[PDB]
Point group: C3
């Protein structure tokens, strides 16, 4: 099989990577199989659970977790295993070992981790993509890389590194979102990340209505443009 | 028996619920019995311990914990078990199971969880109270409810939900504190919460000098103004 | 043996204590022996690991931890055991028990914990030092003490207290750094802390180039006198 994973919060800005995986799961109608709920991994003041209360009674309680679901794009015999959920607060090493065990039983060939970061970049020009891979040969996609060559990492980079150590090829892509538009209905970068998924897994992914949403997005950010304009700086 | 519990920090604003339970324990002279100290539940950078040092030496070290004490209002037949302490950072599920075991041994009939939140509300008019209960028949006290009908919860709501699942009747009340006066000597809401305690447990609670403190409080907030009849805004 | 320990983050401001221990380890060429890596102690969103990536590939992954190394100052025949690393987020009690086991195997006589805090104090006058010790006689170095006589503590104070309880003499010193110059290249307080280390352990520490760096530091803060005022205020 093959994996596309994405982690919320720190490792995802504008919800680009989360939305990317969401879009795959919608398009190809993914089947839930495994959910990693363990309280060994989660600080619940940081990642609070979600309550749903109606007419004086709670009707639903939702705990932070890692959702793993399964997929088959219509033409292909690539199974695609999707992973999505919040970045745990603890026991990362064992969290990664767990995911690897899932990987092992499902006979996964390749892992692709999507993420997104805030950078100094125009919204009126393409999405910069950065990342890392399992070797210098695999960096065929990159000579250079992401905002931190040295510095703090998240679960994306760790897990990536846990795969490489485990001997599974693994690549992470990071989409650069303009810091001034941080609100998380961003489709532009989601597109960009999805295309990287095509590139690694070699199966076409239907973008559907995303371009329309991107073009509407980009126009209606240029909408708020009375004298507020560090753009020249950024554009070049 | 019967429980009144309250959790600090997120679930308590103005220290209204904490002060409510404090006031019960003072009034009825509660006897400490159980203290849940476990380091399985607490992130100590978030909830730091309190040191006491005198003349070059530490004389006391105080660890965050859950204090459980016992009570008997004088006229009353009924034991009141009080719970007070900071909201754990982790293993909520097992934390709640633990409390339930305490509940089981002590044969508790009913649980009442107090909390308080910051809202848009005048300080010159009554305290809005919201919450949830074990059945819609029991929401007699409420048609409509708390700031998040859907959204992130705290230990109050979880524990509440753990009681309901365990088959113990449980109700939570949330007092609405004006965000502009957040400093935590608030008596007004404490009163309000206490009255909800009367309503559920049906034992009168002596308020003593709380009204005096409330009226002094309310007058001395109406004292501090220029430019800022924002309160006229919340006339409505 | 004898210990000099220092903890990062909360307990070290200006990187005074960290730099102090660093300077000892450089000067006396300390030998790494033990590294406490355990994921029982660390919340990894708070203390993130450090990635190093070069030309599309990660080349290094560095996990937060407690480094313990060994030392023998040249004249002396006492071993100095150095400890340095970030303040854990959890299981402090067991973290301290662990360190104590190290202490036990190494037959440690005395522990000295260095720290630093932001205070209202001039940069043009000496470094105020505060702290606590194992007894009132031991406070010969202090009648009086730390910013928090009562209030929240860190791992420094806890560990200190764990040593005292274990029967090992232990002293903590806290250097007062001017809040307005917080940037962590401060040598002034590092000197001060180092001198306290001399005082307890009675072995001279070569300061090397530190004074030069301190006087340069102090002159080039007095250099930026465009805004700053209220000199007199702190000056007494």
């Amino acid at each position: 099989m093959v994996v596309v994973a994405a982690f919320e919060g720190w490792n995802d800005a504008g919800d680009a990577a989360g939305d990317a995986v969401a879009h795959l799961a919608a398009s190809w109608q993914a089947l839930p199989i495994v959910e990693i709920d363990d309280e060994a991994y989660y600080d619940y003041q940081v990642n609070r659970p979600v309550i749903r209360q109606v007419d004086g009674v709670t009707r639903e309680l939702q705990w932070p977790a890692m959702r793993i679901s399964h997929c088959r794009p219509p033409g292909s015999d690539r199974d695609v295993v999707l992973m999505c959920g919040v970045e745990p607060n603890m026991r990362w090493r064992t969290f990664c070992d767990e995911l690897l065990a899932v990987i092992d039983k499902l006979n996964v060939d390749t892992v692709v981790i999507l993420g997104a970061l805030l950078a100094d970049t125009p919204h009126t020009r393409p999405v910069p993509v950065s990342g890392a891979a399992y070797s210098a040969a695999s960096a065929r996609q990159f000579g250079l890389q992401e905002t931190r060559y040295e510095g703090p990492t998240g679960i994306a980079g760790v897990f990536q590194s846990a795969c490489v150590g485990a001997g599974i090829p693994a690549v992470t892509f990071w989409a650069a979102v303009p810091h001034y538009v941080s609100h998380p209905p961003n489709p532009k970068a989601t597109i960009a990340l999805l295309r990287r998924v095509e590139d690694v897994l070699d199966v076409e992914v239907p973008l559907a209505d995303l371009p329309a949403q991107a073009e509407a997005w980009e126009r209606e950010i240029t909408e708020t443009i009375a004298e507020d304009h560090e753009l020249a700086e950024y554009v070049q």
